[PDB]
Amino acid sequence: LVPRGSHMYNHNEIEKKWQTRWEKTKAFKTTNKSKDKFYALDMFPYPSGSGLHVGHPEGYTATDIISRYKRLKGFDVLHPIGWDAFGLPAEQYALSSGKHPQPFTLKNIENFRRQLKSLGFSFDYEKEVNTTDPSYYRWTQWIFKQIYKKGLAEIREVDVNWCPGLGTVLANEEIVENDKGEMVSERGSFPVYKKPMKQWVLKITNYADRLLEDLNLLDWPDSLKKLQTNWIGKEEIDGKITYKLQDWIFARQRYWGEPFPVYFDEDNNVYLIDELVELPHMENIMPSGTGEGPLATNTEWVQYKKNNKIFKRDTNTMPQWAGSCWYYLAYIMKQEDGTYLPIDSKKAYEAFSKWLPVDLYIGGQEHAVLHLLYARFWHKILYDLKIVPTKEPFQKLINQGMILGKDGQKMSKSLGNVVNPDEIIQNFGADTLRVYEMFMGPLTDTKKWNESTVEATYKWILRVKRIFQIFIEDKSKINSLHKDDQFISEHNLLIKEITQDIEDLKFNIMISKLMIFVNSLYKKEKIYSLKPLKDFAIMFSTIAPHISEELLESLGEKEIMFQSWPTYENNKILLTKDIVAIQVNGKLRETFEIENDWDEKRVIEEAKKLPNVKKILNFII
Ligand SMILES: CC(C)C[C@H](N)C(=O)NS(=O)(=O)OC[C@H]1O[C@@H](n2cnc3c(N)ncnc32)[C@H](O)[C@@H]1O
Numbered sequence: 001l002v003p004r005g006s007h008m009y010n011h012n013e014i015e016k017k018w019q020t021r022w023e024k025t026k027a028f029k030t031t032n033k034s035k036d037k038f039y040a041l042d043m044f045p046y047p048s049g050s051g052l053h054v055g056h057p058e059g060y061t062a063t064d065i066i067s068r069y070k071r072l073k074g075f076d077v078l079h080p081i082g083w084d085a086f087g088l089p090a091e092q093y094a095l096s097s098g099k100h101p102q103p104f105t106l107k108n109i110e111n112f113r114r115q116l117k118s119l120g121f122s123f124d125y126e127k128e129v130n131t132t133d134p135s136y137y138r139w140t141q142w143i144f145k146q147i148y149k150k151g152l153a154e155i156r157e158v159d160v161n162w163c164p165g166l167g168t169v170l171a172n173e174e175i176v177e178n179d180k181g182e183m184v185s186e187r188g189s190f191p192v193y194k195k196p197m198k199q200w201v202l203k204i205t206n207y208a209d210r211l212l213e214d215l216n217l218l219d220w221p222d223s224l225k226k227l228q229t230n231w232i233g234k235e236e237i238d239g240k241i242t243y244k245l246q247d248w249i250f251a252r253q254r255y256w257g258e259p260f261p262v263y264f265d266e267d268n269n270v271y272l273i274d275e276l277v278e279l280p281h282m283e284n285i286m287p288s289g290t291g292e293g294p295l296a297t298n299t300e301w302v303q304y305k306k307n308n309k310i311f312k313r314d315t316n317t318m319p320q321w322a323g324s325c326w327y328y329l330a331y332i333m334k335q336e337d338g339t340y341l342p343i344d345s346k347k348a349y350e351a352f353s354k355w356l357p358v359d360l361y362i363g364g365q366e367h368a369v370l371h372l373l374y375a376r377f378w379h380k381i382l383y384d385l386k387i388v389p390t391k392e393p394f395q396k397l398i399n400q401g402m403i404l405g406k407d408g409q410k411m412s413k414s415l416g417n418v419v420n421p422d423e424i425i426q427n428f429g430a431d432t433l434r435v436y437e438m439f440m441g442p443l444t445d446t447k448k449w450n451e452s453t454v455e456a457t458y459k460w461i462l463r464v465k466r467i468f469q470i471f472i473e474d475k476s477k478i479n480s481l482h483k484d485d486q487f488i489s490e491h492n493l494l495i496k497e498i499t500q501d502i503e504d505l506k507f508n509i510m511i512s513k514l515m516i517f518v519n520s521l522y523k524k525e526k527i528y529s530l531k532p533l534k535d536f537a538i539m540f541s542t543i544a545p546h547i548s549e550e551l552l553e554s555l556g557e558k559e560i561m562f563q564s565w566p567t568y569e570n571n572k573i574l575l576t577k578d579i580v581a582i583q584v585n586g587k588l589r590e591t592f593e594i595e596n597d598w599d600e601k602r603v604i605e606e607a608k609k610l611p612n613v614k615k616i617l618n619f620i621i
Pocket of ligand 1: 043044045046047054055056058059084324362363364365367371400401402403404410411412
């Protein structure tokens, strides 16, 4: 049932209005007016279909809520989007559509961008990166070269996973075992087998001990630390320190990827090219199954002329992972005029020191031993080279649970179980989509799409809009003399508890709390002030920004970009609890509330949580 008549509000019109206003007013531009910084990052998407499905926005909603909250708390916020556009995902969608990946990728990116704007994510579109732009992959190639010069890239004979169906080698991390114990590509489920071949490898095993140990520095889920620990698989066996991890098969026999900025002489000595080496435009881009890539047939390009000698260019390309290994840095390098600060410049390093590590990164568990391992590896090499200031790229990682289709499988184009976001956004609105996805369950749980809960979410938003109408359009329903201490208390507590839920990324519970508050407004003949509506709107804006802006405007208030997070007075909350003063050797370092009297020895590990560490809690040596 699509909302109409008395069961609808003007969601399409409101959402377009506010999207337009945010663009004109530059609402999401990354500011630099504070010493408080927050880098909230989504895993950027592949343009490997005609558009997003409703699964994609789930994690993007979660980081948007935090980003929006942080702006309201006065932080400068980096929250950017971009296109993971090289390598197999983009190429395979082009090939399977009978299109050339250059124009087709551009065309699909336009659609993705339109979809994202229609959802009201607070991206600064001036920070966009595209891993296929030559100004971007200039740096991908630079990084590879520095990896080489450090001794960490070489061509050697290894046992590769040959994939006849793709015409290429694949890395061990790109292979999975099926129900019958057979090895297939993680993407496409193409059969593979082992074969000795001379191929480019990156020496990830040389970083294995640090990749393992440095997990201790990270606020990452146990499940993810475990996957990486087991993949690295460090074991002493008969005195040899061994690893299940092998060096990273890095070259692909495909057209659509970064060229290796490399040429060879008659003895196969490797030489490096200093400048950007662009992928030549070719029409003959189908993979040959021979062990060489399609670039090998481009005779004129492969013949590298230097000092009257004819050398041979490398004819492989880099994998899709090369651009995603450093894109979190590219966003910091990206400039208003469309250029990138040089990665090794002083200005880059200072900007990195301001923004890194990413404070909150959300993306799927499927990247456990792919991007989330590989990116850590490149980052550490850059750290060793004094290019980046931190040991680790991403401090806090959350893996959003998969949204499943109605078949109960993970939602994906490949399984033909997708729901098109354009239809939900048309029929119900972006605000409903965002609220619904957070309400489906805990962010980290998997969950199944359910039409009737979508419809219930829309009815709820309609209910919010109608309660605002009641109290705003009739001035007699607001009277500062009205006596209802419990409500003034409920209001102050809402601010406190919603704040805590946002901080905890417990967005489903946050919505339940907003629903309870609305139930309470519907019982009130009068309320003391419009302030609780203003505060509700400001806070709801983090999840339902379009309708929240509309409600704020109808209150005669300023737009969200000029607002602050609501403050509460704890002396209006009708129930107080014990405050425990924590000390470091007789000297006060923190105080905090302990809710109830449940535990005592378990609750001394709650005093360790607070960033500055029943009555007193002294810590003597
Ligand atoms: C950093 C780089 C290596 C990322 C890479 N370019 C990439 O993965 N691109 S992407 O388009 O496939 O995915 C984008 C995001 O969307 C999530 N997602 C996908 N399906 C679902 C689903 N059914 N439910 C919830 N989330 C989903 C997915 O995990 C990821 O974080």
